[PDB]
C-alpha cells in the first residue's frame, strides 16, 4: 500500500548550490520506457 506525505513548496531558490555537468548523449528509448546509450 502506497501513501503520500507533503515535502515542500515548489519554488526557485536564489543562492542554491550550483553543480552537475551538461553532457550531450545519443540515446534510444525502447517500448518499455528504458533509455540506453547509442554508440
Amino acid at each position: 500500500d502506497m501513501y503520500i506525505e507533503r515535502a515542500g513548496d515548489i519554488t526557485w531558490e536564489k543562492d542554491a548550490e550550483v553543480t552537475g555537468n551538461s553532457p550531450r548523449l545519443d540515446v534510444a528509448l525502447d517500448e518499455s520506457g528504458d533509455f540506453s546509450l547509442v554508440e
Binding site: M2, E5, G8, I10, E13, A16, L25
Partner: protein
C-alpha cells in the same frame, strides 16, 4: 486528503519499515509522478484515495485524480533547479545547466545529478518556479554516473 499544491514523498509500508519509493507533484488537484514509482497502483493521502487517471509506460509518467497538468518546457539555454526530495532527507534545490539526450525522435534536456532511486519523480523547475519535468528516468554513462531525462507530459 491533502490536496495542497507542492512536492510529496511517495511511501510504502509493504517492505521493511516505511520506505520511500519516489516523489511527485500536486498541482491543480492532480498528483503527477513517474510510472516506475507506483506501477499505476492507487495512492492514499490520509483517509483519502487517489486513483490513477492517465499513464504511459513508454513516457514513464502517471497522473492521479485528473489529466496531466504540467506543460512548461526547458528553454534549451538556461540553468534549472532539481527540487530533490531524497529518502529520509529534507527537500533541497540544486541548480544545474542541463545537457541533452539526442534521440531519433528529437532532443530532450537531461540533468547530470546523482540521487538514490527513491528520489524519482522530484520536479525540475525553471526560474519562474514552473515544473518543466520530473527526474528519475535516464541512463548510466561511461564512468558510472547517472544522467536523467527532463521527462515532461502533455497537457490535453
Amino acid at each position: 486528503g491533502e490536496t495542497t499544491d507542492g512536492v510529496y514523498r511517495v511511501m510504502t509500508r509493504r517492505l521493511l519499515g516505511s520506505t520511500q519509493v519516489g516523489v511527485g507533484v500536486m498541482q491543480e488537484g492532480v498528483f503527477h509522478t513517474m510510472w516506475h514509482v507506483t506501477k499505476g497502483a492507487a495512492l492514499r493521502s490520509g483517509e483519502g484515495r487517489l486513483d490513477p487517471y492517465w499513464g504511459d509506460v513508454k513516457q514513464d509518467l502517471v497522473s492521479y485524480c485528473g489529466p496531466w497538468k504540467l506543460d512548461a518546457a526547458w528553454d534549451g539555454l538556461s540553468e534549472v533547479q532539481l527540487l530533490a526530495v531524497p529518502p529520509g532527507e529534507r527537500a533541497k534545490n540544486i541548480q544545474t545547466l542541463p545537457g541533452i539526450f539526442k534521440t531519433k525522435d528529437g532532443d530532450i534536456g537531461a540533468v547530470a545529478l546523482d540521487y538514490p532511486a527513491g528520489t524519482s519523480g522530484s520536479p525540475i523547475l525553471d526560474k519562474c518556479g514552473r515544473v518543466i519535468g520530473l527526474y528519475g528516468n535516464g541512463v548510466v554513462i561511461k564512468n558510472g554516473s547517472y544522467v536523467s531525462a527532463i521527462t515532461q507530459g502533455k497537457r490535453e
